[PDB]
Amino acid sequence: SSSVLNMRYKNDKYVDTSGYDSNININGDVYKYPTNKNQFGIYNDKLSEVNISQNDYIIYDNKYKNFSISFWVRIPNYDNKIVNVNNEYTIINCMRDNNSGWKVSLNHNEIIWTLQDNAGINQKLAFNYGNANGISDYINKWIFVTITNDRLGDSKLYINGNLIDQKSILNLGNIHVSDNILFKIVNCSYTRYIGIRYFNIFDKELDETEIQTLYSNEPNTNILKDFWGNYLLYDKEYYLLNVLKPNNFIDRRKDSTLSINNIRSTILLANRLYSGIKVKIQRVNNSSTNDNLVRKNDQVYINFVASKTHLFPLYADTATTNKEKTIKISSSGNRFNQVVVMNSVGNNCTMNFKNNNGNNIGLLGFKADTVVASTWYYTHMRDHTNSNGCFWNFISEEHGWQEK
Amino acid sequence: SSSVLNMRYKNDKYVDTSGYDSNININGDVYKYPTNKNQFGIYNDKLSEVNISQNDYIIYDNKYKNFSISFWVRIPNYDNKIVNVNNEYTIINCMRDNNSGWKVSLNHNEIIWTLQDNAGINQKLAFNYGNANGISDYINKWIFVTITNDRLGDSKLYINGNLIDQKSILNLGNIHVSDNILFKIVNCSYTRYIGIRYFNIFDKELDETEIQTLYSNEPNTNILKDFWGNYLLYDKEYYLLNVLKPNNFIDRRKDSTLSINNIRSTILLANRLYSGIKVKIQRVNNSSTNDNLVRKNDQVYINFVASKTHLFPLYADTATTNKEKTIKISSSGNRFNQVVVMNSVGNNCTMNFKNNNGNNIGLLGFKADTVVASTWYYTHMRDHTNSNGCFWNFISEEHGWQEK
Ligand SMILES: CC(=O)N[C@H]1[C@H](O[C@@H]2[C@H](O)[C@@H](O)[C@H](O[C@H]3[C@H](O)[C@@H](O)[C@H](O)O[C@@H]3CO)O[C@@H]2CO)O[C@H](CO)[C@H](O)[C@@H]1O[C@@H]1O[C@H](CO)[C@H](O)[C@H](O[C@]2(C(=O)O)C[C@H](O)[C@@H](NC(C)=O)[C@H]([C@H](O)[C@H](O)CO)O2)[C@H]1O
């Protein structure tokens, strides 16, 4: 375990599942993601806060004891102009009237951790991810934050399992944190919201191996992710990003094939995300028990989004003596006796075209300028890297990311 | 073998070893590193140039043929004041009077690649490493740069084998590079020098695999590296950095043990490097090569520098029940029948204390606030990370990095 606080959703509210049974209360309007109620949004244009009343005996008051904090945060930039201001605002507050304890704050494209003792001596850690230069891994995406505190060593800041910033806290004396942890946007100039999920406190300094274990497990790997790090959904319009060609987008040709030799236009240095064809994912075998979540090894149809309500199947043209099979839009609504098997490697999604007789056509990818299904990828994967042409992200249009 | 230009040192000059017999001319005062002549230094306070007259065959003049550039660069910041100006200056120029071709340029903590066609259309790739926040892997260090160009897709900038920037060059037409590659610091507003080594042009778009191979193999993998990325040397004074404890330095206690609970002071956010004890390395038995280069599996003595005259052996105190053996300074010059076996994982150095009888005492490391030899590390290594207590860098005091 090591966890002395596990914030999780149960029975239309948030509860502590660590065993220390800390009390969690919602005040005002707190958004719950319908598809993952572990995820909550907080606003600053209303009353909107989560207050954890910590178990009296977990409340950190010490000079020597090690502790760690982990959570995921989602920071929308909207138009990217509203956020472009040098001002620091608190999102998670665990500091007493003494100003002893810790807090998580934000700035323009920045996450900040502050730890301060009873004497007003502090240490601050920062991650500055900056503006989207091509494709951003951070803006409007779930970001896994982990702060580990060694009282005889340094405080270390991790982002998505990677060590970013570490500074000595050997100078820090007795730290007494607030009885309350307040999830609220305080002193933000503009109106916005922030996403929080899987907030944890641990009674030790986590090592890299334990941090990477939390990073992969907490999201639930069995369910595929969209671009933003949310659960991939059936019956939902998505743009396509090829992870090996982040500057390219998919367009329809007149012969009903798909081109990938289209360059994304830039807003400053940021690639446009809402470019090229939109697709919807559909279950092969429907039911009532079935939710809208896309899981590993689910058999689906990839539907091209046409003029309006109209949806045409994507299929691999197998009538060729060349190994790569051209992807075509079926005008007739014929599936050509094919299914697509969904799978993933982290946030990268794969689409394996198979005939209904169970034979492999190949993974969705590209050959020169054309989108194809190819078996080449099975034996030519590049390990522990996003530079594989069979890796795709699904981008849903959202108010959090504006290209208006 | 896709190399069409390979700049290496032979017979008191630089020559093309690719076999395409391009000419390399040294004009004026160009510094050659005595320990690695393949590395050269370029000044802007006087005449300092390397000029490659490319063989007419290798001169790039095409709109479809893929190509890659690779080289290491070393950029000192001195006392981090004179370099703090927004001023883009050229270091490598392959631009025709047409302003067609490519060039490498620098700004404050920045490396820039520019590619331009005959019609003035250009694309720029940038790497901004910024100021030292604790420890910098970039400032006054050998940085491996790799640019690959797909005329049907992206130009890609790699730093130390990692993809940093990629942008479409698909809209670029005929590119005609100049006949000459000029290594010279041009339009830098301040006086400085720049290190270069292992310049290559390739006649294809290298993949991540080939870039990773050049990164590890170009500098001799059998020779250990100092903090800057130069070869580690015998009979040379070094400060110590523990890689797991970058904010800490090693001092001597009055009892002759070594403390690691000493915190580096900062200039802005940059840790001091010239703190704590000085060590020198000495061969147990002299080398047949006639070198001062520290190699993998070399048996050495590590000597504490009390003063320039007075050197004292480091030994592991084996007169204890503890598994970890406290490192001590031998006042009497007694080495207690021990040697140190040097090895490396990339730029990380390991020091294995052993008895002359062949028994292992343990890798140099720490247990809480005390430097130790410990066999624990043998069976408790974390793979694919610098987060190991038995990983060390050796910092030589140099004018390129000032802390004054
Ligand atoms: C946790 C620890 O002390 N590990 C020792 C190891 O201890 C053994 C068991 O693992 C202990 O549980 C047990 O505890 C008993 C006490 O000894 C006893 O007094 C008490 O009465 O009862 C306890 C419960 O029974 O003791 C046994 C003894 O065998 O013993 C080994 C030797 O075999 C090591 O000493 C080990 O400590 C590690 O020592 C190495 C050097 O040998 C090194 O100093 C380690 O320190 C680092 C590291 O390099 O990995 C330093 C890092 O900063 C630190 N943190 C991070 C984030 O990396 C890591 C830790 O691994 C991390 O804090 C937790 O994963 O340690 C040092 O840990």
PDB file of C-alpha atoms in Angstrom, chain B residues 24-164:
ATOM      1  CA  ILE B  24      39.424  19.992 -45.361  1.00  0.00           C
ATOM      2  CA  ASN B  25      41.440  23.258 -44.808  1.00  0.00           C
ATOM      3  CA  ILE B  26      42.453  24.810 -41.411  1.00  0.00           C
ATOM      4  CA  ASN B  27      42.745  28.645 -41.775  1.00  0.00           C
ATOM      5  CA  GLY B  28      44.257  30.492 -38.748  1.00  0.00           C
ATOM      6  CA  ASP B  29      44.327  29.303 -35.084  1.00  0.00           C
ATOM      7  CA  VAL B  30      42.108  26.164 -34.531  1.00  0.00           C
ATOM      8  CA  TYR B  31      42.507  24.381 -31.115  1.00  0.00           C
ATOM      9  CA  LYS B  32      42.907  20.541 -31.175  1.00  0.00           C
ATOM     10  CA  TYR B  33      42.090  18.690 -27.881  1.00  0.00           C
ATOM     11  CA  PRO B  34      45.373  16.862 -26.996  1.00  0.00           C
ATOM     12  CA  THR B  35      43.420  13.781 -25.655  1.00  0.00           C
ATOM     13  CA  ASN B  36      41.022  13.640 -28.699  1.00  0.00           C
ATOM     14  CA  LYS B  37      42.389  15.434 -31.849  1.00  0.00           C
ATOM     15  CA  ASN B  38      39.037  14.661 -33.662  1.00  0.00           C
ATOM     16  CA  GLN B  39      37.616  17.525 -31.478  1.00  0.00           C
ATOM     17  CA  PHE B  40      38.495  21.118 -32.609  1.00  0.00           C
ATOM     18  CA  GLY B  41      37.798  24.634 -31.216  1.00  0.00           C
ATOM     19  CA  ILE B  42      36.747  27.726 -33.276  1.00  0.00           C
ATOM     20  CA  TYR B  43      37.331  31.367 -32.044  1.00  0.00           C
ATOM     21  CA  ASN B  44      35.838  34.743 -33.183  1.00  0.00           C
ATOM     22  CA  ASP B  45      38.538  37.043 -31.573  1.00  0.00           C
ATOM     23  CA  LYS B  46      40.948  36.163 -34.481  1.00  0.00           C
ATOM     24  CA  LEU B  47      41.137  34.138 -37.764  1.00  0.00           C
ATOM     25  CA  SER B  48      39.693  30.637 -36.920  1.00  0.00           C
ATOM     26  CA  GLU B  49      38.001  28.472 -39.626  1.00  0.00           C
ATOM     27  CA  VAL B  50      37.644  24.884 -40.812  1.00  0.00           C
ATOM     28  CA  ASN B  51      36.521  24.912 -44.502  1.00  0.00           C
ATOM     29  CA  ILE B  52      35.432  21.624 -46.208  1.00  0.00           C
ATOM     30  CA  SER B  53      35.624  21.790 -50.058  1.00  0.00           C
ATOM     31  CA  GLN B  54      32.946  19.091 -50.741  1.00  0.00           C
ATOM     32  CA  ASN B  55      33.669  16.602 -53.591  1.00  0.00           C
ATOM     33  CA  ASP B  56      31.524  17.775 -56.597  1.00  0.00           C
ATOM     34  CA  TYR B  57      29.694  14.351 -56.346  1.00  0.00           C
ATOM     35  CA  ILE B  58      28.400  14.741 -52.696  1.00  0.00           C
ATOM     36  CA  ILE B  59      27.281  18.443 -53.128  1.00  0.00           C
ATOM     37  CA  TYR B  60      23.473  18.297 -52.470  1.00  0.00           C
ATOM     38  CA  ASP B  61      21.388  19.706 -55.405  1.00  0.00           C
ATOM     39  CA  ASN B  62      17.960  17.920 -55.452  1.00  0.00           C
ATOM     40  CA  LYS B  63      14.257  18.234 -54.366  1.00  0.00           C
ATOM     41  CA  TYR B  64      13.628  14.484 -53.518  1.00  0.00           C
ATOM     42  CA  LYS B  65      16.927  12.865 -52.268  1.00  0.00           C
ATOM     43  CA  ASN B  66      16.839  12.436 -48.428  1.00  0.00           C
ATOM     44  CA  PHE B  67      19.944  13.414 -46.349  1.00  0.00           C
ATOM     45  CA  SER B  68      21.079  13.657 -42.679  1.00  0.00           C
ATOM     46  CA  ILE B  69      23.670  15.864 -40.850  1.00  0.00           C
ATOM     47  CA  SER B  70      25.354  14.699 -37.576  1.00  0.00           C
ATOM     48  CA  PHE B  71      28.007  16.318 -35.288  1.00  0.00           C
ATOM     49  CA  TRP B  72      28.676  17.091 -31.584  1.00  0.00           C
ATOM     50  CA  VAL B  73      28.961  20.754 -30.394  1.00  0.00           C
ATOM     51  CA  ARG B  74      30.314  22.181 -27.070  1.00  0.00           C
ATOM     52  CA  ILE B  75      29.065  25.687 -26.040  1.00  0.00           C
ATOM     53  CA  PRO B  76      30.639  27.240 -22.890  1.00  0.00           C
ATOM     54  CA  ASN B  77      28.601  29.980 -21.071  1.00  0.00           C
ATOM     55  CA  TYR B  78      31.693  31.187 -19.041  1.00  0.00           C
ATOM     56  CA  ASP B  79      30.247  33.304 -16.104  1.00  0.00           C
ATOM     57  CA  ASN B  80      26.731  33.210 -17.766  1.00  0.00           C
ATOM     58  CA  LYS B  81      26.614  37.020 -18.451  1.00  0.00           C
ATOM     59  CA  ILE B  82      28.330  37.787 -21.847  1.00  0.00           C
ATOM     60  CA  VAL B  83      26.262  34.915 -23.480  1.00  0.00           C
ATOM     61  CA  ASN B  84      22.901  36.324 -22.132  1.00  0.00           C
ATOM     62  CA  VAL B  85      21.915  38.291 -25.337  1.00  0.00           C
ATOM     63  CA  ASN B  86      19.160  37.623 -27.961  1.00  0.00           C
ATOM     64  CA  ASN B  87      21.628  37.333 -30.914  1.00  0.00           C
ATOM     65  CA  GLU B  88      21.482  34.447 -33.482  1.00  0.00           C
ATOM     66  CA  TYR B  89      25.015  33.649 -34.853  1.00  0.00           C
ATOM     67  CA  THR B  90      26.142  31.010 -37.443  1.00  0.00           C
ATOM     68  CA  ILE B  91      28.670  28.216 -36.520  1.00  0.00           C
ATOM     69  CA  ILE B  92      28.268  25.928 -39.644  1.00  0.00           C
ATOM     70  CA  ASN B  93      27.359  27.525 -43.044  1.00  0.00           C
ATOM     71  CA  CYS B  94      26.377  25.551 -46.220  1.00  0.00           C
ATOM     72  CA  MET B  95      24.300  28.455 -47.727  1.00  0.00           C
ATOM     73  CA  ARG B  96      24.914  29.432 -51.419  1.00  0.00           C
ATOM     74  CA  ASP B  97      24.992  33.210 -52.331  1.00  0.00           C
ATOM     75  CA  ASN B  98      21.421  32.227 -53.492  1.00  0.00           C
ATOM     76  CA  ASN B  99      20.654  31.906 -49.696  1.00  0.00           C
ATOM     77  CA  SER B 100      19.850  28.243 -50.677  1.00  0.00           C
ATOM     78  CA  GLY B 101      21.084  25.205 -48.629  1.00  0.00           C
ATOM     79  CA  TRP B 102      21.436  24.712 -44.822  1.00  0.00           C
ATOM     80  CA  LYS B 103      23.258  26.270 -41.803  1.00  0.00           C
ATOM     81  CA  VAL B 104      23.586  25.541 -38.022  1.00  0.00           C
ATOM     82  CA  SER B 105      23.399  28.632 -35.734  1.00  0.00           C
ATOM     83  CA  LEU B 106      23.248  29.303 -31.946  1.00  0.00           C
ATOM     84  CA  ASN B 107      21.463  31.783 -29.642  1.00  0.00           C
ATOM     85  CA  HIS B 108      21.455  32.046 -25.784  1.00  0.00           C
ATOM     86  CA  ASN B 109      21.199  28.328 -24.712  1.00  0.00           C
ATOM     87  CA  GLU B 110      19.781  27.489 -28.217  1.00  0.00           C
ATOM     88  CA  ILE B 111      20.833  25.403 -31.310  1.00  0.00           C
ATOM     89  CA  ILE B 112      19.073  26.203 -34.666  1.00  0.00           C
ATOM     90  CA  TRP B 113      18.952  24.327 -38.045  1.00  0.00           C
ATOM     91  CA  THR B 114      17.821  26.254 -41.199  1.00  0.00           C
ATOM     92  CA  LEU B 115      17.010  24.633 -44.614  1.00  0.00           C
ATOM     93  CA  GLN B 116      16.106  26.883 -47.637  1.00  0.00           C
ATOM     94  CA  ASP B 117      15.291  26.054 -51.331  1.00  0.00           C
ATOM     95  CA  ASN B 118      16.177  28.176 -54.457  1.00  0.00           C
ATOM     96  CA  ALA B 119      12.795  30.065 -54.243  1.00  0.00           C
ATOM     97  CA  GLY B 120      13.605  31.418 -50.706  1.00  0.00           C
ATOM     98  CA  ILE B 121      11.182  28.973 -48.922  1.00  0.00           C
ATOM     99  CA  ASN B 122      12.777  27.787 -45.604  1.00  0.00           C
ATOM    100  CA  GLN B 123      12.058  25.678 -42.459  1.00  0.00           C
ATOM    101  CA  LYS B 124      13.851  26.127 -39.054  1.00  0.00           C
ATOM    102  CA  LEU B 125      14.251  23.535 -36.216  1.00  0.00           C
ATOM    103  CA  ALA B 126      15.242  24.770 -32.691  1.00  0.00           C
ATOM    104  CA  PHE B 127      16.461  23.221 -29.378  1.00  0.00           C
ATOM    105  CA  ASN B 128      16.326  25.588 -26.318  1.00  0.00           C
ATOM    106  CA  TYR B 129      18.076  23.821 -23.344  1.00  0.00           C
ATOM    107  CA  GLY B 130      17.856  27.022 -21.188  1.00  0.00           C
ATOM    108  CA  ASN B 131      19.834  27.921 -18.010  1.00  0.00           C
ATOM    109  CA  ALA B 132      21.202  25.374 -15.451  1.00  0.00           C
ATOM    110  CA  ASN B 133      18.273  24.388 -13.135  1.00  0.00           C
ATOM    111  CA  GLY B 134      20.311  22.310 -10.645  1.00  0.00           C
ATOM    112  CA  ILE B 135      22.582  20.419 -13.136  1.00  0.00           C
ATOM    113  CA  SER B 136      22.575  20.967 -16.968  1.00  0.00           C
ATOM    114  CA  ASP B 137      23.232  18.044 -19.417  1.00  0.00           C
ATOM    115  CA  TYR B 138      23.963  20.705 -22.140  1.00  0.00           C
ATOM    116  CA  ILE B 139      25.960  23.799 -20.929  1.00  0.00           C
ATOM    117  CA  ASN B 140      29.743  23.413 -21.710  1.00  0.00           C
ATOM    118  CA  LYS B 141      29.033  19.692 -22.523  1.00  0.00           C
ATOM    119  CA  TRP B 142      29.407  17.749 -25.834  1.00  0.00           C
ATOM    120  CA  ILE B 143      25.808  17.812 -27.274  1.00  0.00           C
ATOM    121  CA  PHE B 144      25.147  15.227 -30.070  1.00  0.00           C
ATOM    122  CA  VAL B 145      23.026  16.956 -32.808  1.00  0.00           C
ATOM    123  CA  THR B 146      21.383  14.950 -35.673  1.00  0.00           C
ATOM    124  CA  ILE B 147      19.182  16.467 -38.460  1.00  0.00           C
ATOM    125  CA  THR B 148      17.416  14.015 -40.867  1.00  0.00           C
ATOM    126  CA  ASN B 149      15.527  15.390 -43.942  1.00  0.00           C
ATOM    127  CA  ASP B 150      12.623  13.530 -45.675  1.00  0.00           C
ATOM    128  CA  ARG B 151      11.809  15.581 -48.846  1.00  0.00           C
ATOM    129  CA  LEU B 152       8.368  13.782 -48.860  1.00  0.00           C
ATOM    130  CA  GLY B 153       7.809  14.609 -45.112  1.00  0.00           C
ATOM    131  CA  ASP B 154       9.493  16.194 -42.036  1.00  0.00           C
ATOM    132  CA  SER B 155      12.895  17.664 -41.179  1.00  0.00           C
ATOM    133  CA  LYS B 156      13.719  16.206 -37.691  1.00  0.00           C
ATOM    134  CA  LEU B 157      16.152  17.555 -35.008  1.00  0.00           C
ATOM    135  CA  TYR B 158      17.605  14.929 -32.568  1.00  0.00           C
ATOM    136  CA  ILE B 159      19.562  15.922 -29.379  1.00  0.00           C
ATOM    137  CA  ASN B 160      21.525  12.996 -27.773  1.00  0.00           C
ATOM    138  CA  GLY B 161      19.400  10.432 -29.731  1.00  0.00           C
ATOM    139  CA  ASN B 162      16.032  11.986 -28.611  1.00  0.00           C
ATOM    140  CA  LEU B 163      13.557  13.577 -31.121  1.00  0.00           C
ATOM    141  CA  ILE B 164      13.180  17.294 -30.085  1.00  0.00           C
TER     142      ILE B 164
END
